[PDB]
Amino acid sequence: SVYDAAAQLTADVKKDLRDSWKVIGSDKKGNGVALMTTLFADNQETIGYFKRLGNVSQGMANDKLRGHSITLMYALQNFIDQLDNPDDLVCVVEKFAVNHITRKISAAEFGKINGPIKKVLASKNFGDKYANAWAKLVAVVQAAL
Amino acid sequence: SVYDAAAQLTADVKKDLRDSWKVIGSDKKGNGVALMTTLFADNQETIGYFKRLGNVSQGMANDKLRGHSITLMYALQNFIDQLDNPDDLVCVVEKFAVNHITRKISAAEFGKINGPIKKVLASKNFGDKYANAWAKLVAVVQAAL
Ligand code: HEM
Numbered sequence: 001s002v003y004d005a006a007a008q009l010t011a012d013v014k015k016d017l018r019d020s021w022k023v024i025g026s027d028k029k030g031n032g033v034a035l036m037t038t039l040f041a042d043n044q045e046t047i048g049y050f051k052r053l054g055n056v057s058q059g060m061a062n063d064k065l066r067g068h069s070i071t072l073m074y075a076l077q078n079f080i081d082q083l084d085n086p087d088d089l090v091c092v093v094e095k096f097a098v099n100h101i102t103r104k105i106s107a108a109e110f111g112k113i114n115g116p117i118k119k120v121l122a123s124k125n126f127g128d129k130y131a132n133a134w135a136k137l138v139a140v141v142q143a144a145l
Numbered sequence: 146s147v148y149d150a151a152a153q154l155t156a157d158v159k160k161d162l163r164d165s166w167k168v169i170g171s172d173k174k175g176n177g178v179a180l181m182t183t184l185f186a187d188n189q190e191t192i193g194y195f196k197r198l199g200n201v202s203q204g205m206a207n208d209k210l211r212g213h214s215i216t217l218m219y220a221l222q223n224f225i226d227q228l229d230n231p232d233d234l235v236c237v238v239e240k241f242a243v244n245h246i247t248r249k250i251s252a253a254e255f256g257k258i259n260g261p262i263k264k265v266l267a268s269k270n271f272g273d274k275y276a277n278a279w280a281k282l283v284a285v286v287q288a289a290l
């Protein structure tokens with residue numbers, strides 16, 4: 001249930017999301033590209049979903065991947081801005097869920113982003129506490145898939 | 146080229162965009178929904194394209210409509226944040242263009258948003274100079290369609 005998952009975003013979780021986002025969200029291009037390339041490198045079996053982007057091993061040099069990456073960072077921006085209001089967060093979550101459901105992405109496959117998030121956070125000196133906050137957010141999308 | 150169109154936006158046009166977005170982009174739910182419902186009122190022929198959103202006449206009450214509208218505002222957020230780097234603006238524009246090409250939305254039909262934008266701007270007392278600036282940004286997307 002997306003509503004019950006949404007309810008798990010307590011005060012403290014909300015705080016850690018915001019605090020960490022101030023750092024990560026400040027370089028959407030660099031951080032968005034790092035997230036995607038870490039996904040591809042650690043979870044080789046997902047690359048086939050992204051045929052439209054072309055040669056993903058090109059990283060920042062691939063225009064489509066750069067376009068994709070920036071845009072994904074605005075989806076995260078979106079979620080962060082909706083934390084005050086659960087009915088609003090849920091509706092945006094459901095919109096992006098649709099984008100993945102049509103590409104045949106399951107909850108389980110969607111959760112493969114947790115690895116890359118924890119890594120990108122760690123590279124910025126945000127630890128397990130923060131990785132765990134982010135898993136709770138990703139879980140809300142999971143509940144929609 | 147899109148690059149050409151992007152590259153042409155001047156310091157004055159950029160200033161007008163940023164200034165008006167400071168206001169319009171501060172209420173993404175209210176302003177995005179306003180944009181969409183004005184499109185529907187003025188261009189009833191477009192309603193059919195949005196069948197996934199269900200009964201668009203329900204306004205803010207329609208959760209799918211609200212999610213699409215807030216998300217639309219973040220596409221604009223993205224555009225605005227990329228104005229100083231034509232290379233980055235081009236790659237996000239091309240990403241959004243693909244979303245519309247796939248729904249068979251022509252450059253001319255995309256341009257139907259100018260009306261709703263002019264009205265929303267007007268609502269906050271941004272006049273003709275501001276609507277012309279926004280038509281120039283829209284023209285970047287039309288360059289890709
Ligand atoms: C933090 C988690 C994620 C976010 C916020 C997110 C966000 C997005 C957004 C905004 C789009 C563009 C939607 C569209 O234009 O149709 C998208 C597309 C896509 N996503 Fe995700 N994504 C995430 C994780 C994942 C993961 C883990 C997978 C694969 C396991 C995945 C697979 C895809 C694919 C295949 C597409 C379409 C790419 C294309 O052909 O343009 N996403 N994602």
Ligand code: HEM
Nearest residue numbers: 099191194195197216217220221244248250254255257258
């Ligand atoms: C400022 C102008 C516009 C912006 C920034 C914008 C942005 C977006 C975004 C971000 C999406 C979601 C893409 C996806 O997830 O698949 C979308 C979808 C869509 N757009 Fe636009 N759009 C604009 C104008 C228009 C206009 C003028 C039309 C029609 C004449 C249109 C038709 C569509 C349709 C049919 C969809 C798919 C809706 C659905 O079934 O989910 N768009 N747009």
